[PDB]
């Protein structure tokens, strides 16, 4: 009988794309360089394909060992099997860069070469002329 009488809309139950902490605005180029370092350290896997490197390694090992490959190439075979099972249905990511995503949140500070775009007016203006008399 007794129970919650309002919607479970808490942003913890329903995580939302937002920055929960603010920070003094950062120079645009400094923030861009930091984000580049983060991306390099993460090694965004946008390669030809995750399975391409495993296949190349397997083929190279087979070429190196034409006779005893059955026993030599087992770690490579297992790695390639795992890669096929995991990233077989792999699609390259299609999303905006974190730099643009944070420019959206206005994290960075306007420098001489970076300014936030002014609010759109032509696209957002909606006019409705109606008669008002009598």
């Amino acid at each position: 009988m007794n129970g919650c009488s309002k919607r479970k809309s808490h942003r913890l139950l329903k995580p939302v794309f937002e920055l929960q902490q603010s920070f003094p605005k950062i120079q645009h180029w400094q923030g861009a360089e930091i984000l580049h370092r983060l991306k390099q350290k993460e090694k965004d896997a946008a390669v030809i394909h995750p399975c391409i490197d495993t296949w190349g390694d397997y083929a190279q090992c087979l070429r190196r060992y034409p006779a005893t490959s059955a026993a030599r190439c087992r770690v490579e075979s297992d790695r390639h099997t795992r890669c096929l099972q995991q990233h077989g249905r792999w699609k390259p990511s299609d999303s905006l860069e974190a730099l643009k995503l944070l420019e959206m949140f206005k994290v960075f500070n306007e420098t001489a070469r970076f300014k936030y775009p002014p609010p759109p007016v032509h696209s957002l203006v909606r006019g409705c002329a109606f008669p008002f008399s009598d």
Binding site: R11, L12, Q20, S22, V125, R126, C128, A129, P131, F132
Partner: protein
């Protein structure tokens, strides 16, 4: 969930209090009645696509500036020929264009918007909370 500053002071809103709103209604009613008592007068209504699809995005007032040298030019310059009252719902967005407009402007906005951009009171003539 929050890791930001916690304000300690709250600002009141006298412009949008009960009695001030009642006075706004009383003063705007007389002007609207007098305007409607005269014939062949049209009223323009401006808003935002996100607060109104069906509404046309182009009208006679719109100028549609296209050149860089014309950036400073207003887009509602010619509205005075056609209209005798501009009912605005996005004063913050249209402030630069409603500034010193030669037709009366009735603006609808929130106390938060008024306090964050008090300069809209220099482009609004009549206010309806």
């Amino acid at each position: 969930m929050n890791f930001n500053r916690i304000p300690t002071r709250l600002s009141t809103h006298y412009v949008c209090d009960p009695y001030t709103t009642l006075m706004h209604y009383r003063r705007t009613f007389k002007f609207l009645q007098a305007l409607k008592a005269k014939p062949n007068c049209r009223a323009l209504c401006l808003g935002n696509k996100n607060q109104v699809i069906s509404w046309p995005k182009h009208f006679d007032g719109l100028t549609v500036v296209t050149s860089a040298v014309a950036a400073q030019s207003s887009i509602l310059s010619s509205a005075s020929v056609y209209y005798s009252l501009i009912i605005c719902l996005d004063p913050v967005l249209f402030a630069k264009h409603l500034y010193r407009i030669n037709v009366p402007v009735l603006g609808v906005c929130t106390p938060r918007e008024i306090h964050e951009h008090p300069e809209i009171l220099k482009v609004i003539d009549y206010l309806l909370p």
